Amino acid sequence: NLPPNAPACMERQLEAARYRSDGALLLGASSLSGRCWAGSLWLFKDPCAAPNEGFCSAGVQTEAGVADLTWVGERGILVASDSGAVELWELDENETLIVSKFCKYEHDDIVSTVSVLSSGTQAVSGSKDICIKVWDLAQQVVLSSYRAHAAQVTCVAASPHKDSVFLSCSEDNRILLWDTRCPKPASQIGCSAPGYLPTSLAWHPQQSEVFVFGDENGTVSLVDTKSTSCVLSSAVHSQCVTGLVFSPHSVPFLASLSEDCSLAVLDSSLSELFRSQAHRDFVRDATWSPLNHSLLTTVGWDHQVVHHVVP
Amino acid sequence: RVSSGRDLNCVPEIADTLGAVAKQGFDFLCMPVFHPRFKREFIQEPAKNRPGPQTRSDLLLSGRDWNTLIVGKLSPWIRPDSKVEKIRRNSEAAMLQELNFGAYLGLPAFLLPLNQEDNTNLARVLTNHIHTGHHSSMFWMRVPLVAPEDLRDDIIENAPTTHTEEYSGEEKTWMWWHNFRTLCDYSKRIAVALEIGADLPSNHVIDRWLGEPIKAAILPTSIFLTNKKGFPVLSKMHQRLIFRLLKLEVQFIITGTNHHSEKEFCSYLQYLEYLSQNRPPPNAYELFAKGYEDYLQSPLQPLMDNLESQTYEVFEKDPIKYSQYQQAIYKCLLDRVPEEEKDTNVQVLMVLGAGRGPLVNASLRAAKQADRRIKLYAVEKNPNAVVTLENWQFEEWGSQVTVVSSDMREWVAPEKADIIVSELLGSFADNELSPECLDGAQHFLKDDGVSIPGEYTSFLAPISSSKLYNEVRACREKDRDPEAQFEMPYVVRLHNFHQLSAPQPCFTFSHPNRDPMIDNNRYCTLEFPVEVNTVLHGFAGYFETVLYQDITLSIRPETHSPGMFSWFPILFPIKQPITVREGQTICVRFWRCSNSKKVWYEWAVTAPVCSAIHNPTGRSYTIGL
Numbered sequence: 024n025l026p027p028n029a030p031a032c033m034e035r036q037l038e039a040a041r042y043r044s045d046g047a048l049l050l051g052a053s054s055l056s057g058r059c060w061a062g063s064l065w066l067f068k069d070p071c072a073a074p075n076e077g078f079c080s081a082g083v084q085t086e087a088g089v090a091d092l093t094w095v096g097e098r099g100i101l102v103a104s105d106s107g108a109v110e111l112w113e114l115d116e117n118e119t120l121i122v123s124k125f126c127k128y129e130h131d132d133i134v135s136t137v138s139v140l141s142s143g144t145q146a147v148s149g150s151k152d153i154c155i156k157v158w159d160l161a162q163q164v165v166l167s168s169y170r171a172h173a174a175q176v177t178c179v180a181a182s183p184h185k186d187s188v189f190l191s192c193s194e195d196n197r198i199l200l201w202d203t204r205c206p207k208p209a210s211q212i213g214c215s216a217p218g219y220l221p222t223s224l225a226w227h228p229q230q231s232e233v234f235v236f237g238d239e240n241g242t243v244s245l246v247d248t249k250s251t252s253c254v255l256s257s258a259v260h261s262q263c264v265t266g267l268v269f270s271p272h273s274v275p276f277l278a279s280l281s282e283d284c285s286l287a288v289l290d291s292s293l294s295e296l297f298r299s300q301a302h303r304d305f306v307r308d309a310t311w312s313p314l315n316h317s318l319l320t321t322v323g324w325d326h327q328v329v330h331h332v333v334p
Numbered sequence: 335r336v337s338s339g340r341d342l343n344c345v346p347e348i349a350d351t352l353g354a355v356a357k358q359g360f361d362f363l364c365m366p367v368f369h370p371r372f373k374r375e376f377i378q379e380p381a382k383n384r385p386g387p388q389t390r391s392d393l394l395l396s397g398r399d400w401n402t403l404i405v406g407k408l409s410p411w412i413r414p415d416s417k418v419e420k421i422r423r424n425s426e427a428a429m430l431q432e433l434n435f436g437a438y439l440g441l442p443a444f445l446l447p448l449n450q451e452d453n454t455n456l457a458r459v460l461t462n463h464i465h466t467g468h469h470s471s472m473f474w475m476r477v478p479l480v481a482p483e484d485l486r487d488d489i490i491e492n493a494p495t496t497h498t499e500e501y502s503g504e505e506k507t508w509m510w511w512h513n514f515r516t517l518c519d520y521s522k523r524i525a526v527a528l529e530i531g532a533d534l535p536s537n538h539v540i541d542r543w544l545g546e547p548i549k550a551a552i553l554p555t556s557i558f559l560t561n562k563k564g565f566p567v568l569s570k571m572h573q574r575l576i577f578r579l580l581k582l583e584v585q586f587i588i589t590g591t592n593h594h595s596e597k598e599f600c601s602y603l604q605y606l607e608y609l610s611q612n613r614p615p616p617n618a619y620e621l622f623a624k625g626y627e628d629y630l631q632s633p634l635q636p637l638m639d640n641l642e643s644q645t646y647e648v649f650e651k652d653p654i655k656y657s658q659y660q661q662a663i664y665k666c667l668l669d670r671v672p673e674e675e676k677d678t679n680v681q682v683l684m685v686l687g688a689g690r691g692p693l694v695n696a697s698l699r700a701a702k703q704a705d706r707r708i709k710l711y712a713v714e715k716n717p718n719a720v721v722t723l724e725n726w727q728f729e730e731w732g733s734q735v736t737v738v739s740s741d742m743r744e745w746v747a748p749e750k751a752d753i754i755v756s757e758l759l760g761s762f763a764d765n766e767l768s769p770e771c772l773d774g775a776q777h778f779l780k781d782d783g784v785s786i787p788g789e790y791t792s793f794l795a796p797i798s799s800s801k802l803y804n805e806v807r808a809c810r811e812k813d814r815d816p817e818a819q820f821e822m823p824y825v826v827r828l829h830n831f832h833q834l835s836a837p838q839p840c841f842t843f844s845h846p847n848r849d850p851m852i853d854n855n856r857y858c859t860l861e862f863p864v865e866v867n868t869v870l871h872g873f874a875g876y877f878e879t880v881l882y883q884d885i886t887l888s889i890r891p892e893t894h895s896p897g898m899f900s901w902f903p904i905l906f907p908i909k910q911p912i913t914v915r916e917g918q919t920i921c922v923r924f925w926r927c928s929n930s931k932k933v934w935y936e937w938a939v940t941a942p943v944c945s946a947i948h949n950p951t952g953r954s955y956t957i958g959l
């Protein structure tokens with residue numbers, strides 16, 4: 024059986040995989056080829072049934088493609104769209120449908136990265152239009168708009184606990200540390216060398232002054248904000264690092280994504296513990312199960328949902 | 335009206351999206367031909383064997399629609415000048431694939447960005463595509479007026495924006511373009527899509543794009559202000575630029591999402607049409623010139639060639655020209671015969687090169703106006719023109735006019751003249767051989783005789799125009815020097831160009847020439863002070879003439895005789911363009927040379943660098959004596 028207003032077909036290119044604190048799986052997918060270039064949002068209360076369409080809890084189709092996604096609590100879905108819009112999709116009371124709360128066209132090009140700030144009432148979006156926008160999710164408006172960068176914004180990552188703080192990186196070779204509290208909010212941080220372009224950002228979930236970034240040449244970097252001259256880095260991938268996700272563990276593992284179609288799992292020293300070649304196309308997301316902490320669920324452009332067992 | 339298009343980097347259903355933009359009032363659409371986010375791999379397995387389709391089918395539009403309504407767009411992940419080998423290699427293959435798909439589709443144009451200094455490998459890959467079969471497709475290089483790094487918000491505390499003026503730095507985007515089009519060897523198929531931002535740069539920066547092949551202007555919604563009634567409008571400075579760009583007949587492109595959500599997307603368009611309809615009207619010169627803009631013509635040689643009937647017709651529909659000739663004759667006759675002699679002293683007036691007779695009639699209207707007596711002689715070498723003259727002499731003029739069917743240099747006159755009148759001038763004054771003709775004629779002028787015109791001077795000005803250089807470069811003919819097209823002047827209504835310095839007088843001739851040893855050969859050195867950074871492509875020539883006293887004719891822009899749409903400026907190209915820095919002087923040498931059979935010009939730039947001497951011995955160009 025298929026839920027109401029949901030299509031019987033799923034878009035081949037899987038963009039985002041996000042677990043809710045209960046364990047239900049959020050899927051964002053785009054049609055990147057063929058006649059129709061659109062997107063969709065899917066919910067799976069049974070995560071082992073995904074990617075299969077006729078065995079979902081909820082499903083909706085968007086006008087344009089899904090470049091990025093984030094949970095807004097337990098019933099909210101914040102969408103980075105090709106349309107230049109930031110979309111907030113409100114979940115149903117019975118959690119059967121996915122209904123459009125707001126769709127605002129503020130960015131002048133594809134919105135590529137979205138991150139919800141620690142309060143859950145504010146969010147930051149990064150776009151190909153080179154802008155960075157701070158959003159108020161209740162009033163459905165842009166609070167602040169920053170042209171800090173000189174090239175397309177690749178990754179915006181909100182800090183774990185400060186609403187003022189978020190990282191951003193761009194094809195202009197800048198990693199910017201932000202604090203909405205300063206009159207000049209952004210601050211250029213990173214390694215001594217200019218190196219390769221920054222592609223992915225992830226804060227440490229415990230050390231609040233520490234983060235990790237992946238470059239376009241497959242190198243993962245461990246950076247402390249204070250020292251501002253990178254401590255440790257390993258060449259984890261043969262191609263661009265798409266995403267970096269820390270495990271929910273008190274002592275966390277780092278999941279490394281790539282266009283080399285592999286997933287790697289690393290420790291504190293960035294050493295390789297696990298690697299999966301399960302995917303036949305680009306690895307686009309990773310989420311660890313809130314329930315089984317040793318489980319890691321990846322999605323790819325090969326329309327595969329691979330559930331991993333990390334020891 | 336206005337040729338305008340819509341820029342979209344998001345098209346979910348190609349058929350629906352096209353109808354919507356046509357409904358809004360757009361003549362075309364700029365869109366991706368592969369999904370912008372859809373990165374393809376060409377070397378490494380498993381991503382290399384990604385199953386198809388790789389984009390949407392060509393069957394989704396008619397051939398006509400692809401040919402006329404769709405401008406293709408390069409995918410933004412394609413970076414042929416990336417510092418990462420792997421990315422460079424995939425971007426090359428991806429660029430070829432998308433460019434070849436655009437060619438397959440039959441697209442009229444395709445957009446590629448210049449968003450950084452180094453675009454060498456992008457230029458290499460485009461050049462190789464351009465030489466892979468002969469096609470008519472155009473390439474639009476998306477360049478901003480202001481680099482994004484120079485317009486960023488001053489919000490990075492440890493990396494502030496440079497407030498210090500950097501004259502050359504503010505023109506960096508022109509250098510990105512110049513290098514790219516130099517590397518691509520000035521392909522006629524490569525043009526500019528000039529992206530205009532919120533805050534315009536210095537006037538000098540906007541002045542660099544003078545003479546450049548601007549085919550499209552990109553206006554983002556972000557740059558439109560909001561008027562009191564909520565409509566999108568532009569700053570007075572932004573309006574000036576649009577007015578300057580309408581003259582270039584560019585296609586305007588609207589990019590970005592709608593920020594005037596109260597109104598529709600035709601709102602941004604309606605402002606452009608409104609601005610289009612509210613421009614200072616095209617004057618008699620601007621209206622006549624329409625169609626001839628930067629169109630290269632050969633200078634007339636009416637001595638060597640017998641002009642066709644319709645050439646005479648063009649240079650007759652100029653009443654200002656013959657009002658001034660009439661006035662110069664009127665004023666001369668009064669100075670030669672006083673009121674007491676107004677019926678005893680009859681003046682020998684010779685029209686030398688009478689054409690179809692408008693100068694003859696002008697000498698008639700100037701005899702009755704001055705109420706003085708004249709005996710007219712109408713000399714003309716062109717026997718076909720003499721047909722029109724001899725029919726005029728029979729049907730209207732009568733015994734007053736004596737038509738002479740001869741060249742003025744070979745004619746034996748029965749009596750000496752009081753006034754010899756002629757229009758033997760061209761766009762560079764002496765370029766139709768007025769000195770030589772009038773020297774061969776002054777023997778039959780009285781010792782106190784008047785020549786109308788009595789003096790003429792040519793002027794030169796250095797110009798920049800990569801459009802006109804390319805236009806010339808295209809004039810190669812088989813069975814002649816592959817470079818002879820740069821060693822000849824062109825009559826051209828100079829349009830898309832930049833005058834680098836004030837016109838300065840070159841060669842002057844006076845009539846009659848009282849010199850015991852008359853020499854029509856010349857050598858002139860000019861020093862043109864340049865206050866811009868530019869590229870010199872050639873020299874525009876104009877003239878000035880004194881018919882009689884204060885009565886003059888001019889095509890020098892400063893002193894232009896108003897209404898004289900007849901004469902267009904001449905262009906003297908140079909084989910190789912020359913970089914000129916701000917503060918430098920352009921020094922040019924010009925010679926007027928001759929032998930018994932022919933006359934020609936030779937020219938060379940000596941400063942800031944040397945050129946070759948152009949047209950040595952009249953090898954590429956001569957004026958037949």
Ligand SMILES: Nc1ncnc2c1nc1n2[C@@H]2O[C@@H]([C@@H](O)[C@H]2O)[C@@H](c2ccc(F)c(F)c2)CCN1
Pocket residue numbers: 636637640641645646647649650686687688689690713714715716719740741742743757758759766771
């Ligand atoms: N050495 C010479 N002996 C006798 N006649 C000569 C001549 N040289 C020229 N002419 C004849 O005079 C005119 C031509 O008809 C020409 O055949 C004249 C002209 C050109 C274009 C016009 F539209 C125009 F109205 C008038 C200029 C050319 N000079």
